[PDB]
Every structure is written in C-alpha cells, then in structure tokens.
Subunit: 246 residues, 4 copies
C-alpha cells in the first residue's frame, strides 16, 4: 500500500533509455499504466516491448504541438487521462558562450523549457477535473549550480523550476502537485561521452565517489508520484551524491 | 518485496510517543525495520513498546542528557547490534519575540534541537562506518529556511541542523552513510495545536495546499530517505510543506 | 573620491526610459559612468538623452530584434569604445493563469526576458575579456525564486536568468568579468501600478517592510555590483525585496 | 551622499585584524562613529590607534553577558546608542566529527551563534525606539556549503542565518534591517594556517582564481549598512569569487 500507483495513468517523455527508461519501468512496477515516448516509431515499439501489458510506447516530439495533441488523444482513448506526467525528454547543445549559436540556444529553450509549458498545460485540465494529479520535471544539478559551457542548458533547467513553483501555486488547492527531481551526474549516454580526465574531474566533485544510477532517479520520481507525497509541491528533490547541497 | 525494504535494519527514532515521531516509527516498522522509539517518560516508552509489539521497543531518553544518550545507545547495541538508521525527531519550542526572549529559552532550544543532533549523530557514527552503510535523517522545519517572528531560537536551531547535516554528509559519504534533513511545514500535532484560532486560520492561508500536513506525510519522506533506494541523496533538505515555501 | 567610482566606464542600461532602469541609469551617471540608456521609442531615447545630458545618451533598442542589438552596440563601440558594464533591465509581463496562457504570451516572455540576456551578454563579452574587466548585472525578480500564480512564464524566464548567470559567471571569472543578478521585490513602477486595489493591499501584506520598494533602491544594488569594490561577487543573486522572501 | 553613514554609531565586534579591521576602517571612512572590539585591553588600544577621532576600541568578550552590558553602556555614554551592529567576532574549533570534543562544539555555539542572539537583543531596543537600524552578521560560505571537519562552525554559521531571517521578520516594520554577509575564503590569519596543498585545493574551487581580500567583505558590509540598503532584509550577500552560487 506504500507507494502504490495502481489505477494511475503515467506519461514519461523520452523513455527509450537511461533515466527515462528507468522511470517508466519503476512506475509500471508500482502499478501504473505507463506510456513512454521516443522520437521514432521504432523507439516507441522498443518501449512497448519492455512495458508489455503494463502500458505502451508512443512516438512524441515535445517541440511539436500537433504531436503533443495526437499523443494525448491516443492516451485518453486507450488508457484515460494522464494522472502523472514526467517531463524527462531533454537534450544538450553545449558550447562556451563565445561559440554558442542562436540555434543551440533556441533548440535548448524549445526542447527543455517550452516543452514543459506545453505538456503541463495539456494535461492539467484532466487533473483539475479529477482534483488529483502529479507533474514531475526532470531537472539537473546544473540548473542550480551552473556549469561552464552549458549556459543554455542551465537556463532551461533553472527556468523549469521557476515554472514549477508558479504552477504549483496555481493548482495546489485542486489536489495537483508539481515538483522537480534534479539529478547529479548519472551514468547514461549523456555521460559515457565525457573523456577520462573529465570523468575523473566530475567524480572528484562528488562526496559519494561515484556517478548515480538511472534507477536512483527513478526511485525519487516514483516517490513524488505517490499518494504519500501529496504534501510536497513546488519542491526540488536533489539526487546528486552530494555534488551540490542546497 | 525488496522495494523500500528495511528488513535487517535497526532504527532509532527519538520522540516517538506522539506526533511526527510516532508516525515515523510506525512506518519504519511497517517497512521491516527493528524500531526503537523514545519518549521522555516511562509511560510513553511503554506506549511505544505497546504499539510496536514484535517490531521493536520503547525506551526513555532525554536528548539533552549525555548519560541518557549513552545508556539508551548501549541498550540498543547490547540487544539489537546498534543503530543503522537514526531519525533525530525530538524537538521543542520556546517561542517569544526577541525582546522578551529569556536566556533559558535560547539555551533550552539550542540544547534540545541542535546540540542533540551533534551528540546522537556522533554516537551512532562509528558503528555505521564499520558496516559501511547508514542513514541519519534529521527532522528540521520550514521555519529554519523561512524564518518566523517569535521563533528566532527555533529557527536558528533548525537552520543549524542543516549546516551540520551538510558538513557531516561531506565527511561520511564515501563510507556509505547518507545524512539528510526532512523539513516539514505545519503538521497536525500537539505543537501546531498550540496556535489560537486566528493564528491557525492565518497559517492555513499561507499554505497553497490549504490544509495542514499529516504526520504520515513526514513519515513517508523519512522512510524514503532511510531506504536503500536513496543512497545517492545526501546533504539534502527535503521540504514537505504544501507549498508554504519553495526552494 | 575613488569609492564606488565608475569614472572611465561605459554602461549600457536597457529600458532606461522609466522605472527601475531610469533610476539605474541616473545613479550610474552620478557615480561617473558614461551611460547609454535605451527605450523602445525615439521619444523615450531622446528623453534619456535629455536627463543624462553630458553624462551619456539615449538610443532606441528592441532587445527581441538582433539587428537592433547589433546596431546599438556598434553605435556604442564606434563612439564610446564599447561596453564595460551591461545592465539587462528591459523586461515585460504577459500574465495569465496557465490554463489561459497563450503560446504568444509564453514566447513573448522567453524572447524579451530570457533570450535577450543571452544575446546582449554574448555581444558584449569579447570586449570585456579583451580588457580583462567587466560587469554584467541582470535584473531578475523575487518571482523567479518564489514563483507566483498567473506568472509561470515570467517566473520561468526570471529563474532562467539565474541559471544563465551562474554558468556565464563560471566561464568568465578568471578573466576579470563578474556576472550577477539583482532580484527586486515589488517596486513602485508602471508594472506594479498594474495591480488593482485589493491585489496591491494583499501584496503589501506579504512584505515585512510594509511598503513597496523604490526604483532607487534597486539602482543602489546594481551600482554596488557594478563597482570595482564588488570584484569578488560573482554568480550571486542579490535580493532586494523588503523581506517578501528570504533565501 | 551615496553610502553616507555620517551621524551613525557602529559597533564592529572583533575589529583587531583581518575582516573586522577592514570593516571598522571602511565604516569610519563613510562617516560613522565606530567602536571596534578586541578580547584584550591592548587589542582595544590598537583599535583606538587606527580609528583616531573616528571612534574608539573597547575590550569585549561576546560570550560574557556582563562584558556585553558594560560595553554597550560605555558606548551609550560616550557616543549614544548603537545604530549599526556588525557581528564579526567568531572562531573555529575544527575536527572531524569522530574527534570533535564537547567543548569544541560548545565553544563554537557560544562564540559564533549565541553571541549573535545576545548582542542583537541588547542593541534592538534603541534601534526600535528610533525606528531605524542595521544589524549585519558576518557568516561564511561554509554555513551554506558545509565543510568536512567544520560541522560545528557550519552549524553555527547556518544558525545565524535562521536567526537573522526570524529577527528580520519581527523588526522590519520598525525600520530595522537584519542581514548576513557570507565571505568565501579570505586572506587572513584563519587562512595563512592552511598548508600549500590545502591552499591550492581551496583556490581550485574558486572561479575567480584567488582568495578574497578583507576590504571586499568590508565593502559588502558597508553597503548593507547604508540608507540605500533599506529594502534589503533577511538576505545573505555571498562574497566568495564564485566558490558557491546560490
Ligand atoms: N544523464 C545525466 O547525467 C543527467 C543528469 C541530470 C539531468 N538529466 C536530465 O535527464 C533527462 C534524461 O536524460 P538522459 O541522460 O537519460 O538522456 P538521453 O539518454 O539522451 O535520453 C533522452 C530522451 O529524450 C528523448 N528526446 C530528445 N528530444 C526529444 C524531443 N524533441 N521530443 C521527445 N523526446 C525527445 C530521446 O528520444 P530518442 O530515444 O528517440 O532519441 C530520449 O528518450 C534529461 O532531461 C536530462 O537533461 C540527465
Ligand atoms: N508543525 C509541526 O508539528 C512541525 C513542523 C516542522 C517541524 N517539526 C519538528 O518535528 C519534530 C516532532 O514534532 P511534533 O510536532 O511531532 O512534536 P510533539 O508532538 O511536541 O512531539 C515531540 C516529541 O519529542 C519528544 N521530546 C521532547 N523533548 C524531548 C527531549 N528533551 N528528549 C527526548 N525527547 C523529547 C517528546 O517526548 P514526550 O512525549 O515524552 O514529551 C515527543 O515524543 C520536532 O523536531 C519539531 O520541531 C514539527
Ligand atoms: N515590481 C517591479 O516593478 C519589478 C519587480 C521585479 C523585477 N522587475 C524587473 O525590473 C525590470 C524593469 O521593470 P520596471 O518595473 O521598471 O518596468 P517598466 O516600468 O515597465 O519599464 C520597462 C522598461 O523596459 C523597456 N522595454 C520593454 N520592452 C522592451 C523591449 N522589447 N526592448 C527593449 N526595451 C524594452 C521599456 O521601454 P519603453 O519605455 O520604451 O516601453 C522600459 O524602459 C524588468 O526586467 C522587470 O521584470 C520589476
Ligand atoms: N578568514 C576567512 O576566510 C573567513 C571566511 C568566512 C567567514 N569568516 C568569518 O569572519 C569573521 C572574522 O574572521 P577573520 O578571518 O578576520 O578572523 P580573525 O582573524 O581570527 O579575528 C577574529 C576576531 O574576533 C575576536 N574574537 C574571538 N573571540 C572573541 C570573543 N569571545 N569575544 C569577542 N571577540 C572575539 C578576535 O579578538 P582578538 O583579536 O582579541 O583575538 C578577533 O578580533 C568570523 O566570524 C569568521 O568566522 C572568515
């Protein structure tokens, strides 16, 4: 009965690998009907393969309003309205400011910040009608700490928290909570990229002495998604091994 | 199952006779922990024994008395093998505007709400290091982060809990121990039930959720941080306040 | 004297026709800076020229238009040698509850309040690096830290300003440039004068100081961060809010 | 007229060297009548030597209520009531928790936290009568970040901020502001202590690439002390070269 999501419909954007996959799997373990998304049809099918009778994968581009609308209609049709939205889809377009292109700025705003606006708005009417809901944004320690060469990504991840706090204020009295989980450096395809010196240097900033695991983010998201977290709203739950302490 | 499972862990929860501490103790027992809850009185310690049953026991502890701390921890070590999860929940208020605040109101709070965290945390740390696994969870307050008129002593102690938590977290992270604070908003307990009708109405007006929190809601946050699943969370303050304050 | 002295520095203050930006511009000129203040209109740009007199000049700038940015910065470089102190003050609101919020209300805010900071900051940075000295000061808002119903777009932009500020600060600190945000509470300007009587009363009730702030009070904080005396402050948010929020 | 303190009486605790000396000197430059303190009579005289006709040094132990009372009476007698209180006096008693003595804990609570309570209370009646005042606490980045081997110091410096916020709420409507300046690592006698590896390691955590100067803390304190900072209360002004970004 602890942390039970039976009866809830969850949408996890960008569930094909790493953190989003871990989130989608754990939410299904806890009893939710889960819809995970990828940017391609084959990616969507790979999600359906791992969810089995616990849900389905769908193709979604969170920068395209028509895609968002089609996906939410399909979910409502087959499963009913979204009770738990996890805004996990996100990208990087790293560069020092001196080298940062207009398109690198805009791609990050569109994918990592504006998406959260669009998806949150799109699921909110259903949640307000039922007087119950969860929105959980996947932020980053970089949103709080800043990082050289990621001024775009940091702006977007910080903006997500300001959005979250304001939305939380609007919807709290109607039983909807809005929160962010901010991972530190987690072992995924974003990371295996870093070279050895960079990895060693990232690790040296972590008291725990290791990168996080995707499952560790999934656990934090599942906790905030639960009935037991009803009195948490407008909050950022930092899961970073002590890399930053707020 | 093995999800949020605390089987095999020994938990000490200070001030488990009522309120938030009682809810913490009951939930940690539900999750499989062997729980020792404490009260300042023998009647409270027996009431804790009674509600825990085969899942644990109650002991009398005054967290301002080092001899009491030493005795309780020895009892726990002798029988159960010593503390894997420490929940520093015991705390009090001694409210007054600063111009009316007595030296004893200041010291009572430092001793009960802040120095207690230093003493208890130090006393359990050796055993946790040896096992390469531990959890310390301090119960802070939204007031530590926000401040509150009439509670400068309480606010200083609760803010100081976080400073301690961050420092200890940096010291012990590489040996498998996490140290974190859960900071409740206004929770329905005897401490809240203190406020008059006007003050309660005015407090509720500050909470977006439009209600006080339930002790169980703090227990859930504590149980989550106590779990194996929270091993990458350390030096963190988890705010459970209905939106009263947002960090 | 040489205390908080800005003689020899070129300051660009966006949105200096009224409100907080006007007060910033007037104070930076008082402290010795050569000030270029901007308005969206030629009448406003001339009014700025008129109040600055021999201490500076006004120019028309729309911070959402990259051609306008390029033209203004070239004018400043050609005449005055380019910007030593950038104050990103220009900003707007497009308030609505989320369920009523239009795509254009979201985009107008991202563009005016957030992307403008990226564009202007990038455009002045090369010159500041070359000189091994610079100041960028962004005007944020208490709303970026606290959130506010009806302002999710504004709050996201203002919070995003801080994320940008921290990252840029880390990039440019070792080359003599500091990057910081001043986050005002509710300040008496046309933006505040927006609120109805009930809303204004309710806003004042949230401010311990019991008044709105004055534009001059934000100008003072900006002037302090712009000074040589603030060289060890970077990546910081200086809150000027009468106690409305406390971090 | 900018940052003018003419007519104000300032008490700076622990003004014999480093940060406190810099604070006392700058406040006097800006026109305040300054009383700086040391723990000895010779220390007090050294303060009187540098202040000259701008003020005086006094012997004060901020852990002793009778000393506090005597010092405030002497100030009221000679200068009038304290308008600006700068709580700068502070010590370290470093140790890993495993080695931390009860006396090392208590000395830090008494000197660094309880002192702020006692002095603040003692100056507040005068400030509330006049409907104008400034209290500025000298915190530490360690209060916000934490630091291994300084759990006592971090507790005390963090507690100072919770105290400050609560006091600010009580006194704001009567024209008194209460704030903290949180230095990063500043070149003083606290620091020259660190060995070369430790210095190098501290510096590597600072984007600015240098330790701060005492004058840099003095400037921040003088700004908060000014009439121009009337709308700042309950705030922490971080002066740390980017070592931590809040
Ligand atoms: N990895 C880390 O250390 C780390 C740390 C902190 C925060 N985060 C945050 O965690 C989230 C997931 O990160 P991750 O490391 O697991 O990333 P990942 O491995 O790169 O996966 C990203 C996911 O987002 C999807 N996606 C990208 N653009 C999209 C778009 N326009 N519309 C819909 N979906 C899109 C991808 O779809 P496809 O599979 O079809 O490409 C993919 O499933 C991101 O928000 C990230 O910023 C990550
Ligand atoms: N709204 C809230 O209630 C709220 C909000 C935020 C934070 N908190 C914090 O949450 C914690 C629990 O509060 P609560 O509301 O549940 O309080 P409560 O109902 O007053 O319960 C206090 C508990 O602490 C014990 N205790 C008190 N002094 C002690 C001492 N010197 N030594 C050992 N135990 C002692 C009490 O034992 P006895 O039963 O024997 O007296 C009791 O079990 C406290 O740290 C409090 O500051 C409360
Ligand atoms: N309570 C407050 O007033 C408050 C609180 C916190 C933060 N702030 C922030 O403080 C800043 C100044 O606000 P305020 O209250 O003084 O505002 P205001 O009175 O509305 O003044 C706005 C200024 O920005 C200029 N501006 C607007 N849009 C622009 C654009 N697209 N390009 C270039 N300039 C543009 C305006 O030019 P025109 O005169 O030509 O229209 C004007 O000079 C804003 O960033 C605001 O978000 C205000
Ligand atoms: N140095 C740093 O990097 C640094 C960084 C962050 C924050 N801080 C904080 O800044 C403040 C000043 O530090 P600092 O580095 O300049 O220190 P310092 O060089 O050690 O000077 C400390 C001052 O406090 C006085 N003092 C000590 N105990 C006292 C007591 N019981 N009663 C009255 N006065 C007492 C000393 O008096 P005597 O001269 O008579 O001994 C001295 O004037 C402290 O609060 C410190 O925690 C320092």
């Amino acid at each position: 009965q602890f942390m039970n999501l039976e009866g809830k419909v969850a949408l996890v954007t960008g569930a094909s690998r790493g953190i989003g996959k871990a989130i989608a799997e754990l939410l299904a373990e806890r009893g939710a009907k889960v819809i995970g998304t990828a940017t391609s049809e084959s990616g969507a099918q790979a999600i359906s393969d791992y969810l089995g009778d616990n849900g389905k994968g769908m193709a979604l581009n969170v920068t395209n309003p028509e895609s968002i609308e089609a996906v939410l209609k399909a979910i409502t049709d087959e499963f009913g309205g979204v009770d738990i939205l996890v805004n996990n889809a996100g990208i990087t377009r790293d560069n020092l400011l001196m080298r940062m292109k207009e398109e690198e700025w805009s791609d990050i705003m569109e994918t990592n910040l504006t998406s959260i606006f669009r998806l949150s708005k799109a699921v909110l009417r259903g949640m307000m009608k039922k007087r119950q809901g969860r929105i959980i944004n996947v932020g980053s320690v970089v949103g709080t700490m800043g990082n050289a060469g990621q001024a775009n990504y940091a702006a977007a991840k910080a903006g997500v928290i300001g959005f979250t706090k304001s939305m939380a204020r609007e919807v709290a009295s109607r039983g909807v909570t809005v929160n962010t989980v901010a991972p530190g450096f987690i072992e995924t395809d974003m990371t295996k990229a870093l070279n050895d010196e960079q990895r060693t240097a990232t690790l040296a900033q972590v008291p725990a002495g290791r990168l996080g695991d995707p499952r560790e983010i999934a656990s934090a998201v599942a906790f905030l998604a639960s009935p037991e977290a009803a009195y948490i709203t407008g909050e950022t739950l930092h899961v970073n091994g002590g890399m930053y302490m707020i």
